Amino acid sequence: EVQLVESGGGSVQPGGSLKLSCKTSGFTFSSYWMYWYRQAPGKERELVSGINTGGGSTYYADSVKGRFTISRDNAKNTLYLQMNSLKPEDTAVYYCARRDRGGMDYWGKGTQVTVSSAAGH
Ligand code: NA
């Protein structure tokens, strides 16, 4: 079965950094564009970033430009999101997704990121 599994979430200080991983199995990852989405409190789901097969970013949301970097490792079949200069409003469940025209969408279960002044340093 197709598997997408996010990890790397947790609590982090405002201004801090986190790197999320989306480890995949059960399909030819290197053939697909891949995406990060997020679901924040009281808001609609938001597309964060997309990446093409060869590992070039296709898109960043205005809200994350200059702070986040999408990347992939086709040898490990893993997608990443490096997040920097985190803000309270980046608190959300983050999801990786495989989506393509006339194909079936697949989503991970998501990972919680919490940007909090009470986070460990
Ligand atoms: Na896709």
Side-chain angles (χ1 to χ4, degrees):
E1 137 174 71
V2 172
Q3 298 299 337
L4 304 178
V5 181
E6 306 89 349
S7 63
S11 300
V12 55
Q13 282 281 323
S17 293
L18 272 178
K19 191 175 192 170
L20 306 184
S21 301
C22 168
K23 294 178 190 183
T24 79
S25 67
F27 67 106
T28 305
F29 174 82
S30 65
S31 291
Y32 288 89
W33 293 22
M34 294 291 300
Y35 306 87
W36 289 101
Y37 282 80
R38 67 186 178 177
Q39 172 66 78
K43 295 197 186 319
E44 301 303 321
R45 179 178 68 190
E46 184 179 25
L47 172 65
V48 175
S49 188
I51 190 168
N52 68 23
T53 61
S57 63
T58 59
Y59 178 79
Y60 290 101
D62 289 346
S63 54
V64 307
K65 284 176 167 175
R67 299 188 301 118
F68 292 9
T69 303
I70 192 167
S71 64
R72 67 194 295 155
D73 178 342
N74 285 344
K76 293 182 171 177
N77 302 294
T78 300
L79 175 73
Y80 305 97
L81 187 68
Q82 175 70 56
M83 296 185 297
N84 303 275
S85 299
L86 284 160
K87 303 170 187 182
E89 52 265 42
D90 299 313
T91 296
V93 184
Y94 286 73
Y95 296 87
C96 56
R98 191 194 92 178
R99 313 189 69 175
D100 74 300
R101 189 167 216 105
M104 189 178 160
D105 293 339
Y106 287 96
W107 301 80
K109 291 184 177 74
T111 188
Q112 181 73 59
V113 170
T114 301
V115 185
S116 169
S117 282
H121 311 160

